[model samples]
Target: STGSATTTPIDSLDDAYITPVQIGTPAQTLNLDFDTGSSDLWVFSSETTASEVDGQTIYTPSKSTTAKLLSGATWSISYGDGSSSSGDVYTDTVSVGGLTVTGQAVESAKKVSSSFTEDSTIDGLLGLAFSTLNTVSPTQQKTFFDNAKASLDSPVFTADLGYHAPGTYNFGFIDTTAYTGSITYTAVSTKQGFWEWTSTGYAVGSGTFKSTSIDGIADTGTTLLYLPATVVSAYWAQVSGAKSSSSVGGYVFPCSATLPSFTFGVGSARIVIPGDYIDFGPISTGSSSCFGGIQSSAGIGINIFGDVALKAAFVVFNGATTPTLGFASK
Candidate 1:
C-alpha cells in the first residue's frame, strides 16, 4: 500500500469543501463534499427526480460501462442542519484525487432536501466518517478511503482545511512544510461512530484558561464550531453588544465590535482561534449583525470542531492502531 491521493477544494472555505471524483467505468467526474460527519457516498444521479434537482449535476451510471445495481440496497440520511438525501445503491468504480477504488458503492439520490438541492456547487457527498455509521442497508457501504486504505502505505489522511485560501486533503504521507512546531496527538473515542475526543480546557482571548472538559467530534462536514451552551454563553459575555438571539439562531453582535480570541485544549496542547476567525461574518440579510462561529452545541450533546476551528490547525485523522487526532499549527 504505497499509493496516495490529494484533494483540492472545488469551492471556497465558506462552506463544505468540494472535491472531484470519477465514478463508473468511463469515470463520470462529480463535485462532492468530503464529509466526516456522516458515512455514505451518495451522488446526485439519474435516479433523482428531475424537479428535485436544482442546478446540481447528475451522475448517470448507465453511461458508466462498469456500473452495476445492488439489488435491494438503499440509503437515506438526515443532517443536523435538516438536510437529507435518500437513494438506491450502485456498485461502480470510483476514484478521488488520483486514487481509485474498484467496485465502490455509490448511492444514487432519488430525493434531496431543499437545502441540498439549492447548493448547486456540490453534486454529492463522499462520507469520511466510520463505516459503522453508513446508511446503506442489508449491505453497508465502504468509503473510498476505507476501501483504498488497505492498499495505502499508511491508512491515514490529513485535512489541511483553510479560511479564505486553498488547503489540501493530503493522503498517505504528511508534508512537513504544511505545519509549524510539533504534532500533538490525543486519543479519540469512536464509540459514537465519530472521531470524538475531549478537550482539557479553553480560554477566551487573553483571559486565563478555564479548567473545563469539552467532549466533541471533529467533523469536516460541519461548517461552524459548536460548543456547550454554557461555554458559548461565556464567550459572548466578553463581547460588547453581543447577545444570543433566537431569531438569528445564535449569539449576534455588532459587526464592528472587536471579538475575543478562543483557545481549546488537546493532549497537553493548546490550540487558539483568532478573534476574527470566531466572528463568522455578518448575517445574510443584515448589515450590522454578525453571527458567532462558536455556537452552542445545545441539544446536540457534543461539541463540533468544524471548519471554523479546523481551519486554524493542521489535523491528522489517523485510523492506524489507535484512532487518534493529531494537531499542529499551520
Candidate 2:
C-alpha cells in the first residue's frame, strides 16, 4: 500500500519539519519530526519527569490496550547538537499517513534535554534512517520504514520539503507530478546508518563548478547545510560584510547583503539554491546581522546536505538491499 502525509515547518527559519503520526490502538495523534539522520522512534510520554514536561504532548502507554511493555528494553540517543533523550521501550501499533506497522518499538521518554523540553512544536521524533542506528539496548529495533518496507508497494520514501511552506512525504510510490525532468540516481553509503552520498561538485552563484567529490548525508532533521570550510568560505566570500563569528556560533553578515546563489551538482544535473534561502534570518529580533544557512562542517567530520539543500530538490530514499538515492529538480 502507498501513503502520503503533509509535513510543516515548525518556525519561519524552517528549523525542522513535523508530520502528524498515529500511535496506539485508539489512534492518538501527535506531530513528530520525521528525521532521516537518526534512528529510534521516541516520544514524550507519561513516563517523563513532570518537571521536564511543559506544553508538549505525551504518549500514554497505559491508556492504549494494544501497548505492551518490552521487558528489559531501554534506549538513549544523543545528537550532534548535544540534545539527548532516554527511556524505556514499548511495542505498539504505529501509523504514518495511512501505512500501519504493528509491534513497532515506541521508546517512551523518561528524560529529555532542556532544548527538547522547551520546544513545544514537536511532540516526538520518528526516525527514518537505517535500523542499524537504533539505540535500543539488548535488542535493537527496526524503524517504522524498515518494518513497513515489505508491505509497501515499493521499498522507498520521498521527501519533498518546501521553503517556509508545507511539504509532503510519500511512501511506497513516487508521485510523478511532484517533480520535473528525470531523477539523477546515485549510490548511497549507509556505513554510518545515514543516507550518505557524494556530489560531483559545487558553484557559487554564476561561478564555474568545481570538479570535486563532496561526501555528505541527506539529513531532514538538520536545519543548515554544512560543508567543508573551503566550500563554505568560498560561498560566503561572495557576499559583502560576511564574516565568521565565534559569539554568533558561525558565519554572520549584514541583513542587506546581496547574497549569491549556490549550486551543487548531482551527476550532470545542477540544483540551485536561491540566495534568500542562505540569509537564515536575523541573529536576533530586529538585529541587522543575519545568520548564514551554509556553515563549515570542520569539527563535525561529515558534511550535511540538510534542509537548506534538501528543500531545493526532490529526494528519494530507496530501501532496497542495495540501497540507492535519487534526486530530481522540483
Candidate 3:
C-alpha cells in the first residue's frame, strides 16, 4: 500500500530529478521526471516517432500482456517551459518502488517537442499534482497518487529533493527520521491543479525578515526558484557584482561573488536555502559569470518555489479532505 523511490538529478546542474518506474506485466523500466506542477503520467513509448527516440528508454505496450489500449482515449499537455507531448492512452500495471497500481492510465507519446528529445535522461513525466489537471479527454484519468490514495496508509506523499545528490519520495507514511524539529503546515489550494500555498514572509540571507504573503507552487519539476521581481531584485542586490542581464535573460553575477542565503516562511517556520545553493552555477565552463538560482517571475504569471527552494526542506503533500502542505527542516 506504501512505496518509496530514489530520485537523482539527471545532470550536474540539478536541472531535473528522475526516478525509476516499472510499467506493464513484465515491467519496462524507465526514468521519469516526477512533476508536481502538472498532471499526466505520460511516457516515451514504441508509439513515439523513431527520430525522437534518442538514447532514452521507451515503453512498448505490445511487449506487456497486461497492457490494454484505452479505446479512443488520447492526451496532450503543454508545460510551463513550452515542452509538449501528446499521444494515445493505455491502461497497465504500474509500480513505483513497492506500491503497485492496476489499470493505471499511461499516456503513450506519439509526438514530443525538441526539448524532450534533446534531454534523453528523462523518458517522460509522472505527474503528482491533482488529477483534475489530467489532459486525457472524455474520461479524465486519475493520477497515480490519486488512484493509490485509498490503499495507502495515509493519503500523503513526501518529497525530499537533494542538491546534486539522490533523494527520495515516500508514500503513505512520513519518515520521522527524514526531518528535524516540528513540521509547519499550511493550507493548499488545488484550484490551479498544483500544490499551491502562500508563504508568510522572506529574508535575504541574515537580513531583516520582510513580512508579506508570497503565493507560489511547490514544483519539484522546475529547476530554479522564481519570485516576484521585487523579491528577486532584493536578493540579487545583496550580492556584489550581481546584475540583471538582458543577454543571459536573468540576474547573473561574478562566479566568485559571495552569495547570500534565502529564507521563506511556511507558517511560522523559516526554511533557509544556503548561499551555495543560490549560486546555481557558472554561465559556462571556466566562465566568470554565473546564473542565479533565484530569478524574477515577472512574466511567469505564477511564482514558482522550485527545486532550489524545495531541496532546502522536507515537503509533504497531504491529500486529506482539505489538502495541506507541510514543511520541515532537513
Candidate 4:
C-alpha cells in the first residue's frame, strides 16, 4: 500500500558489490550488502567483540524492544576478499522506505573483523540477486525473494543504481516511466540462475564490427562487461587513434574526444553501452589503458553484460510469476 519508493546509497567495489540492509526491531537503520551472487541476509550484532568488528556496522538487538534471536541458527560467511563474519539467526520487523514488512528473518554476527566492523555507515548485506546460491538456507529451498514476494505489489524486483548518487532497489512495482516504451519480456533459461540472453553481435558508431548472429548473457551481478578478445580488440580499433592506457587496470582508455556509442543487439532489443565506463582509473600495472566499454575476460567464456550495461535499461526479474526477465525504459 506504500505508494512512495525510497532510495538507499550503496558502496561499489571493483567486482560487483552487494547492497546493505537495516536490521533491528522497530528497525534500527543498517546498510546491508545486497548480493545476487549469493543469497541470505546476515549482520553483525552487539554481542560481537569490538576487536572482531571494525570498518563495518553491527546491529545491537538489546537497544530495541522488538528484537528476537534464533539461539541455534548460527552461521558464518567468507568472501573472496578474505573477509568473514559469524552470526546467529533472528526474526525482526524490517522496512525499506515506506513499505514495512513484518516477521522478516535476519542474522546477528557475534564475531567480525576490523575490515568489516569499523564501517558504521553500513550495517549488513541483503542478498537480492538470485536465491539459488544462498548459504543460510536450512532446507535449501526458499530465498529472501521467495519469502518477500507475497508482500510485493507485482511479484517483480528492480535494482536502479546511481553511480555516486543514492539509488534504489524496488520490490513488487515496476516504474514504467523510467523506460522509453512498453516492456520487453525475455524467457528465462533454467540452465543457470543468471539472466541469460542471445546477443546478435555488437556495433560501434555506424560500423557493425561483426555479423548480427551471435549470442550471450546479461548478468547484473558482474561489474564489468566481459567480451571475447577478438571483439574487444576490434572494437577498440574503431576509436580513431584511441589507445589503451596501462594505468587504469588495463580496462580504461584516455582520449580527448568523445567516443562513439556501442550497442549490442539482443534479439529485437538493442542495448547500448556508453563509452565513459570503458575508461577506468589505474587498475592495471604501468600506464597502459584498456578498453573501458568492452574488456577481454580471457577464458571466462560467455560474453556478459554486467551492471555497467544493465543500468542503461530498466530491468525486471519476475521469478514468482513466470521465471522471466522483463525490460523497459527506466
Candidate 5:
C-alpha cells in the first residue's frame, strides 16, 4: 500500500515516460520507463549494437543469473517525438517496492542513443499508467500492474506522486487521509489512453473564467497543467506583483506575499491548487521584463491536467470492469 518516491523522465515520446528499475538480487539495475500509456514493460539491453545503444540504459542479462531472453522475437517503439528504440524480446524477474513478479515479459532495446545513455541517475522506466494505448500484442502485453496484481494486497492500485524531495509513491491501496470527502468516478474512453472529460470553467484567486464547455484529456504522464493561452494569461493577471520571466520556462511569477488559491471545475467537481505551488522561483526574462503563471502555449493542442492536478486526487484506471477512470479520496 505504501511505497518510496522515484523520478522518471518523460521521454520525448510525448506518450510514455522512462525510469530505471533494479531487477536482480543485489539489484543489477536497468533503466525503464513506467508507462501507463502502454501495457508492455521494456528496457535497453546488452545485445544492442553500440550504435543503437546510445543514450539508453542497457541491461546485461548475463550479469543476472535469473534473466531470460525470449528467442527470435524482435521489438521496437516509435514515440510522438520521432525517436525510437529497437531490440529483441526478453523475460526477467522484476521487482518494485517490496513486491516481486517473475517471468514478466519486457523488451530489451539493442539500439539506443547517448542522450539516454549518459544519464546514470535515471536508468530505465516503469510503465504503470494504463494499457488502453498499449503497443504490445494481447498475447505479449503485460503491465507492471497486471504482473503485480496477484502479489498486491488489493485488486486496485493507486499512484500518489509526491512532488517534494523524497516524494512519496504508493501502490495496492489508496490513502484516504489526503482528501476531504468521497471521491468521484468518471468514464474512460477506449479510443485514446488519456482520461477524457469536459470542463465548464476554471477559477483562480478571486477571478473565475468560464470556458465554452471544452472537452479535454487528463494526462498524468505530463509534468504541468497546460491550459488554453487565454485562460493562462487571465489567471496570471490576478497574481499581485506577478511578472513573466523566461529563465524557468513558461511565465515566471514573483509573489513573496500570500497568493490566492486556484481552482478548476471538471463537471461539478471543484479542485483547488494551493498558493505554495504559485510561489515560483525567479527566472531571467528577455533583457528585463519577467512574467508569471499566464504565458503562451499558443498552438499546443487541448488542455492537459498533468501530475500537478493528478496528485490532488487518488486516480484509478479501471480497465477490467469496463474502460473507466475513477477518482477517490487519498
Candidate 6:
C-alpha cells in the first residue's frame, strides 16, 4: 500500500536528488536520479567501456541469477542538455523502496556521452513518467511503476524534493504528514506521455497574475525552470541588472542583486517561488555572475517545471485514469 525512499541532494550545482534502487535477483543496488521527465531505466553497467566510466558504480547483470537479456532489444536516449546514454536491455527484478517488480526492463549502458562520464555520482535514471514514454527500440518497455501498480494500494507517487536537504519519494499512497495544508489538485493531460498541465497564470514580485495559459511538463530530471522567451524576459526585467548572454549561459545578474518572487497558478491555488530561489547560483565554472533558475524553453516546444521550480513545493503525481496533480507549500 505504501512504500517510500529517502532522497538526498547532490552537491554539484544543486543539480538533482537521488535514491538507491535494487536491480536483478541478488539486488545490484545503484544510486539513481528519480526522474519524471523520461521513461527509461538505464544504468551505468559493466558493458560500459572502462574509459567512459569514472567513479561510478557499475551494475553487472551477469552476477544476478535472475537477469535475462531481452533478446536484441536496445535503448538510446538524449536529454535537452545534450547528455545521453545507450545500451542493451535485460529483464530483471528492479526494486524501489519496498516495492519490487520482476521482469522489469533494465537498460544497461555500453556507452555514454561526455556529459555523463564527466559527472561524478548518479549511477543512472529511474524514470517515473508514463510507461508509454519508454525509449526501448523495436518494442516498447514497461516501467517499474507500471508493472508494480497492480500491487500498489493506490496509483500515486509524491515528490518532496527539498532544496539542499534530503526529501522523500513515497509510492502508492500519499503521506499527509509530509505536507502542510490541503493539496490543490489540477487535472493533467498526458496526451504527450508526460505529466503535462497548464498553469492558469503567473506573476512577478507582487504584480497582478497574468491569465495566460502556460503549458508545461513536470520534469524532475531537468535542473532549471523553462518557459517562453518573453515570459523569461519579463521575469528578468524585474531585476535591476539582468541580461541574457551566451558567455554566462542564459540570464545572468549581479550576485548581490535583490530579486522578486515568481508565482504560478493552478486552479485557484498559487505556488510562489521566493526571490532568492530565482538566483540559480553561478552561470558555470569560472563565472562570478549568477543565472536565474528560469530560462527560455527555446528549442523545446513546451515549458518545463524542473527541479528548480518543483523543489519549491510538494508535488503529487497521480497515476489514476484522470491523472491529476496536487501541489502544496513545502
User: How many pairs of residues in model 5 come into backbone collision?
Assistant: 42
Q: Give every collision pair in model 2.
A: none
Model 6 per-residue lDDT tens digits across residues 1-330: 567998888774568888999988788889999899989999999999889999888899899999999998999998878888999999998888888888999999999999888776899999988888899989999877778877889988889988778888988998888878779998898889899998888899899988898999989988889999988989999887899988757889878898898999888888898887677777666666888888899878889999878888899998887898889986
lDDT, candidate 5, equals 0.56
lDDT of 1 by residue, 71-96 (tens): 99999999988889998999998876
- Steric clash pairs (candidate 1): 1-151, 1-152, 1-153
Model 4 lDDT per residue over 5-98, tens place: 3334444333343454545565577666555444557776677776766656567777767777655566677753366776677777666655
lDDT of each: 0.85, 0.94, 0.94, 0.61, 0.56, 0.87
Predicted candidate 2 versus true structure: per-residue lDDT over 1-330, tens digit per residue:
888999999998899999999999899788999999999899999999999888998899999999999999999999988999999999999989998999999999999999999999999999999999999999999999999999999999999999999999999998999999989989899999999999999999999999789999999999999999999999999988999999999999999898899999888888899888787889999999999999999989999999999999999999999999899999
Order the candidate numbers by lDDT, best to worst.
Answer: 3, 2, 6, 1, 4, 5
Could you tell me how far off, in angstroms, the CA of residue 156 lies in candidate 4 after the best superposition? 0.3
- Model 1 off-target regions past 4 Å? 1-13
Q: Cα deviation of 230 in candidate 6 (Å)?
A: 2.1
Clashing pairs in 6: none
Clash totals in order = 3, 0, 0, 53, 42, 0
Two-way lDDT contest, 1 vs 4, winner: 1
Displacement of the residue 83 alpha carbon in candidate 4, Å: 5.6
Candidate 2 stretches greater than 4 Å from native: none
Instruction: Order candidates by TM-score, high to low.
Output: 2, 3, 6, 1, 4, 5
Q: Candidate 3's residue-wise lDDT over 250-297, tens digit each?
A: 999999888889999998889999988887788888899999999999
- Candidate 6: regions farther than 4 A off: 284-286
Every model's TM-score: 0.95, 0.99, 0.99, 0.78, 0.73, 0.96
